């Protein structure tokens, strides 16, 4: 990769936290820190869970009524965004945003209410549904 991706973790100081022993669902509440690598998140509620027999295939969501995300993007095209929920996946590109979802980068800005983004990158997509599921 580069170097630093296992010196700086996701760090979480917290008040109203819980950590399960069995499936290992985790939740933080009321006051929560979230920073990692070159990224910051702000939230009142944070959750992390593991669809993982293998590791780093963990999934995280953050809620700040609205939550916000901030990224010093590698290539000199930094980005930040805001939504009722924000989401990330720990072996993966993908961020997703829902409820009043807004993002702005050197490449583009978008308002919508259901938007996906790629942390390695400068590209975004909105998914205007009509029962397509």
């Amino acid at each position: 990769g580069k170097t630093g991706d296992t010196d700086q973790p996701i760090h979480i100081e917290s008040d109203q936290q819980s950590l399960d022993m069995q499936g290992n669902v985790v939740t933080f509440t009321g006051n929560v820190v979230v920073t990692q690598g070159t990224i910051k998140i702000n939230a009142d509620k944070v959750v992390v869970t593991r669809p993982g027999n293998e590791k780093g295939k963990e999934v995280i969501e953050g809620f700040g009524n609205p939550a916000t995300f901030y990224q010093m993007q590698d290539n000199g095209k930094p980005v930040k965004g805001r939504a009722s929920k924000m989401r990330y996946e720990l072996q993966n590109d993908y961020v997703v945003l829902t409820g009043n979802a807004y993002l702005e980068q050197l490449d583009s800005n978008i308002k919508g209410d259901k938007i996906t983004y790629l942390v390695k990158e400068q590209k975004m997509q909105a998914f205007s549904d009509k029962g397509r599921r």
């Binding site: 973790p9 996701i10 100081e13 917290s14 950590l19 933080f28």
Partner: peptide, 16 residues
């Protein structure tokens, strides 16, 4: 990246 969280009731930490 790893996750590394700290609990109010011990002031000390774990990985995930």
């Amino acid at each position: 990246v790893p996750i590394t969280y700290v609990n109010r009731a011990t002031x000390k930490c774990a990985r995930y």
